Ligand binder design. Structure first.
Ligand SMILES: O=P(O)(O)OC[C@@H](O)[C@@H](O)c1cnc[nH]1
Ligand SMILES: O=P(O)(O)OC[C@@H](O)[C@@H](O)c1cnc[nH]1
Ligand SMILES: O=P(O)(O)OC[C@@H](O)[C@@H](O)c1cnc[nH]1
Ligand SMILES: O=P(O)(O)OC[C@@H](O)[C@@H](O)c1cnc[nH]1
Ligand SMILES: O=P(O)(O)OC[C@@H](O)[C@@H](O)c1cnc[nH]1
Ligand SMILES: O=P(O)(O)OC[C@@H](O)[C@@H](O)c1cnc[nH]1
Ligand SMILES: [Cl-]
Ligand SMILES: [Cl-]
Ligand SMILES: [Mn+2]
Ligand SMILES: [Mn+2]
Ligand SMILES: [Mn+2]
Ligand SMILES: [Mn+2]
Ligand SMILES: [Mn+2]
Ligand SMILES: [Mn+2]
Ligand SMILES: [Mn+2]
Ligand SMILES: [Mn+2]
Ligand SMILES: [Mn+2]
Ligand SMILES: [Mn+2]
Ligand SMILES: [Mn+2]
Ligand SMILES: [Mn+2]
Lengths: 191, 191, 191, 191, 191, 191
C-alpha cells in the first residue's frame, strides 16, 4: 500500500532500502557504521515504519559517503512511498526529551525540499562517537537531515532547544524527526 | 450544529461570514484584497472549516478597514459557533514550516480574549505584498490576530521562530492559527 | 460668525476650503488622495468644525503637492476664522488612544507659528499607505502639521507616545490635533 | 437612564455590581480584599459613579480570582450602562499626582477593547500590600485594567510617569482611570 | 486497571494519594495549602486523571515539607499506575497560553528520572501567593516538578516561554505538565 | 467669597498679597525683580485670579529672599482662599507650548504639600535672565514651585517635556501651573 524498495549503487556504496509507512516498527539496519545503525533503528521504530536498510560503502575513508548515500536512498524511499500524499495529516512535529537534552522536529510533506537545522551546540561540529568499529562524526547529523529532506522533497526543521551529551543530542534529533514523520504520514480522518 | 452567520455593516465596510467548525475545508473568500483572500482561504482550509467570506470596503483608502472588519466579524462567528464549548479539546497548537520560515500558534478557547504575537522580523512592520490589485501591508498581521482573538474571546499566541520571505512568514502564521484552532475546536473523547 | 472660505490656485493644485469653527462635524473632503481625505474628515469631525475641502492637483507626480497646498489653505482658513481670538480658551490638548497607539497634541493659538513633532517611530519616514487610488507616504504627516501651524500662525506640538501600526499612528495624530483645536477655539466663559 | 446590574457566578466567585454612570459618588464595595475595596471605592467616587460591588470568592487561594471576576463584571456593567454611546465626549484623560507619584490614564470608548499599561516600577511585579485581612499583590494592577477594558470594550491606556510608594502608585492609577472615565462618559454638548 | 494508592507518613507529613490514569477528571485535593490544592486540581483535571489527595503536614513551619511530600507521593503513584508502560504513546507535550503567559511541558515516560525547568522569570524565586490561609512560595514550583519526575522515574521538561503574573505563570506550568502527561499515558493504537 | 490678604514681614522682605480665586485676571505685581513680576503676572492672569503683589526686599544681595518670601506668602494666600475646598474640581493640569518649549503642570489640592519638578534642562541651574534692573537666576524656578506647594499645602508636579530658551522654559512653567490651578480651583458641578 505505502511501500518502496530503493536500490542505489555508486562508486562509493551499495544501498537497499525497504520501507513501509504503515508499519509497526519492524526495523533492521546494517550500514557498517554501528552508531548510524542505532540512529536509523531509532528513526524507523519511533516512526512506526517497517524499515530494512542494508548498506556497504568505503568506510576505510570514513562513514560520510555511506551515511550520505543511505540518507539519500531513505529520502527517495520516503518520497516514493508517500506517492500523491492524498488524505494525510501532512504536518507533524514532536518534542523529544532525552535526560538533559530537548530536541524538536517539525515537518511539512509539501513536495518542496527544505531543511533548517538550529541550536546544535558548537562542540558537535568536531565530536566523534567512537566504539570498537567505524566511528560517527556528529558534524554529519545536519547532512543526514538535509539529504533526507532533499530526496523525500519535504520541509524538515530540526531544533536542539538545549543539551550537553552528543549521543543524547543526536539520538533526540533522530527520534524527533521519526515522531514528526509518524504524525505527518498518518491518514487525516477529515481531508 | 456548530455554525454561525454574521453580518457586519459599518460606514467603511459590509461583511457576511458563514462558518461551520465541523467542515471539510469548503472555503470561498472575496474581500477585494486578494492576498488577504489567500490568507483566509489558507486559514479556512487548514482549520477544516467550511467558510464563506464576502466583504466590500473602502479599499480606495487602503485594505486596513476591510481587513480589520473582516477579522472582527470572523472572530464573532468563531465565538458564536463554539457556543458553550462543552466537550472540546480547548487547547490546540501547530508548527508550520514554510521553506526557511517556522511559525507556531497556540490557542486556549478560554472565553478570555488575549493575543500575544512575537518573533516577526522588524522588516514586516513596513513590508507591502503588492500585485495587480489592492496591496496588503504585513504590519496588519498583528491586527488580524488581535481582532480574531478579541472577538472570538480566546487566547491566541502566534510566534515566528525564524524566517525571511514576508509571504512565507505571513502564510505560515495564518496556517499555524488554522491548525491550532482545528485541534482546539475538535470534540475531546474524554471530557 | 467664525467662518472663512479660502481659494488657493497654484501651478500644481486648485483648493477651496469652507471652514466654520462653531460647527457640528458636517465634513466633506475630496482631495484625490483618499487616505488624506480620511485624515482631514477625522480632523474636521473630531474638531466639531463644519469643513468642506475640494482639491485637485498633480497626483501623477505623487500626493505631496496636493497634500501640502491643502494644509496651507486649511491653515490660512483656521487663522482667518479665528480673527482677533478675543474670549477663547486659547490653549487646548488631547490624548488619543487608538488600539496600541497613544498620541497627544497641545496647541497655543498665539499668532506665533511653531510646530514640534516628536516620537513618531522611524519606520513612518518611509511607510506607504496604499489602496486602489493615489497612495499616502506617512513621511508627509510632519509636513501637514508644519503647514497647518505656519499658516494658522499657531503653536502646534504633536507627540506619539508609542505605537506600531502606521494607520493608527497617523489617525491618532490627526484626531489629537482635532480635539486640541476644538478645546482651544471654544469660548472661555471667564475671559 | 445609564444603569446596569450585573450578576456573575463562577466556580471561584459570586459578584453583584450596580452601576449608574450619572451618579454623585455613592459607593459601597465589599470584595473580601480590603485594599481592593479601597481602590474600587476610589474608582467609583472619582468617576462620580454610583457603584455597589458585593463579591465573595476563594480568598483562601489568594485575591486573584475575586479581583479578576470583579473587574470582568465591572467592565461588563460599564459597557452595558454606556449602551449606544450616542452624544458622549468619548475621549477622557486625567493626571493624578499622589505625593511623589504621577499617574495618567487616557480612554477612548471605541467598542474596541485595548489596554496598554506602562511605566509601573519593576518592584510592583512582586510587591504585597498586607494588613490584618487578605493581602493585595500589586502585580494584579495590570490584570484589573486589562479585565476592565476587555469587558467594557474600550481603549484604556494607563501610565506611571514616576513614583516610589506602591500604595501611591496603585491608588494614583485607579484614580486616573476614574477621572478619565468621568470625562469620557459625560454628555458632549456639541455632538 | 491503571490505579495506585500511595500512603506516605513522615515526621513532617501524612499523605494519601488515589490515582487512576484512565479517569474523567474526578479530582479532590486537600493539602492545607489552598493555592497548591488549586494547582494539583488543575493538574488532575487537565490530565483526565481521577485523583484524590489528602495531606496534613507541618504548615506552622511553611508549606514546603507538605508540598514536597505530596509531590513525592504523587510521583510514586504515577510510576506505580504506569506499571510496565506497554502500548502507551510514551511522549507527550502541551503548550498552555494563560493570558500573557505561554508555558510548555514535554515528557518521556523513559524510567530515567530527569527534570529540566527553564524560562521562569527571576521574580518567581522570591514571590509569595498569599490568601487567608497558608501561603505558597513560587520558588517551590521547580521543587514540585523535580519531585514528580524523580519519583515517577520520567523525563519532564517544563518551559516558560514568557509571562508576568506569578499565578498565570505557575498555573500554566501545572496545566502544561497535566496535558503532556495525558498525551504520554494514552494507549498508542500502533505499538 | 474666595479671597485672602496675607502680610509677611521678615528681616529680609515685606510682602502684601491680595488674592481672589474667582477673578478675571486683574493682576498687579511689583517685587523689585522685573522678570519675576512678569512671571507672577502670567501666573495671576492665566489662573483667572485677581492678584495684587507688593514686595520690597534685600535685592542688594540678589532676588532670592524676595522671590522666596513672595512665593511663601502667595502659597499661604492660595491655601487660605481655598478654605475647606468643598465642591471644587480638586485636580487640574495644563500643557503650555511656548515656541520650541512644551511644559506641563498637574495639581491635586490635597492638603498634602508635595512638589516634583522634572525635565528642566541642566543649563537653567546656572542661567541668568538680566535686564536693566535686578536679574533673575533660573535656578530659583524650582524654589518658587516648592515654596508655593509647601505653603498652599497642595501637590504640584511641574514638567518640562523639552525646550531651549530659558525665558520660554520658565514662562511656560509658570503658565502651566497657572492653568492647572485654574482648572483645580473651579467649582465641580457634580460634587
Ligand atoms: O528510548 P529507547 O528505548 O528507544 O532508547 C534506548 C536507550 O537506552 C539508549 O538509546 C540510550 C540511552 N542513553 C543514550 N542512549
Ligand atoms: O500549502 P498550500 O498548498 O496550502 O499552499 C500553496 C502554496 O503553493 C502557496 O501558497 C505558496 C508557496 N510559497 C508561497 N505561497
Ligand atoms: O473613531 P472613528 O469612528 O472616527 O474612526 C473609525 C475607525 O473605524 C477607522 O478610522 C479605523 C480603525 N482602525 C483604523 N482606522
Ligand atoms: O484623595 P482621597 O481623599 O480620595 O484619598 C484619601 C487618602 O488619605 C488615602 O487614600 C491615602 C493617602 N496615602 C495613601 N492613601
Ligand atoms: O482554565 P480553568 O477553568 O481550569 O481555570 C479557571 C481560571 O478561571 C482560574 O484558575 C484563573 C484565572 N486566572 C488565574 N486563575
Ligand atoms: O502669551 P502672553 O500674551 O501671556 O505672553 C506675551 C509674550 O509675548 C511674552 O511673554 C513672550 C514671548 N516670548 C517670550 N516672552
Ligand atoms: Cl505626558
Ligand atoms: Cl518551542
Ligand atoms: Mn557529502
Ligand atoms: Mn543510544
Ligand atoms: Mn485598526
Ligand atoms: Mn502563498
Ligand atoms: Mn513640500
Ligand atoms: Mn482609519
Ligand atoms: Mn487571571
Ligand atoms: Mn490609600
Ligand atoms: Mn525540599
Ligand atoms: Mn487560578
Ligand atoms: Mn531659600
Ligand atoms: Mn515673556
Amino acid at each position: 500500500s505505502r511501500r518502496a524498495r530503493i536500490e542505489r549503487r555508486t562508486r562509493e556504496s551499495d544501498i537497499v532500502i525497504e520501507l513501509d509507512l504503515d508499519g509497526t516498527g519492524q526495523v533492521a539496519v546494517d550500514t557498517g557504521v554501528p552508531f548510524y545503525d542505532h540512529m536509523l533503528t531509532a528513526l524507523g521504530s519511533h516512526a512506526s515504519f517497517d524499515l530494512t536498510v542494508r548498506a556497504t560503502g568505503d568506510v576505510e575513508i570514513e562513514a560520510h559517503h555511506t551515511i550520505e548515500d543511505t540518507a539519500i536512498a531513505l529520502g527517495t524511499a520516503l518520497g516514493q512511498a508517500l506517492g500523491d500524499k492524498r488524505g494525510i495529516r501532512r504536518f507533524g512535529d514532536a518534542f523529544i526529551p532525552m535526560d538533559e537534552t530537548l530536541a524538536h522536529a517539525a515537518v511539512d510533506l509539501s513536495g518542496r525540499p527544505y531543511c533548517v537545522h538550529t541550536g546544535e551546540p558548537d562542540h558537535l561540529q568536531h565530536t566523534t562517537i567512537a566504539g570498537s568499529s567505524v566511528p560517527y562524526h556528529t558534524v554529519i547529523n545536519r547532512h543526514v537531515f538535509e539529504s533526507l529532506a532533499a530526496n523525500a522533497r519535504i520541509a524538515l526543521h530540526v531544533r536542539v532547544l538545549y543539551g550537553r551529551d552528543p549521543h543524547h543530542i543526536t539520538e533526540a534529533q533522530y527520534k524527533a524527526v521519526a515522531r514528526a514523520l509518524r504524525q505527518a504520514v498518518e491518514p487525516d480522518p477529515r481531508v
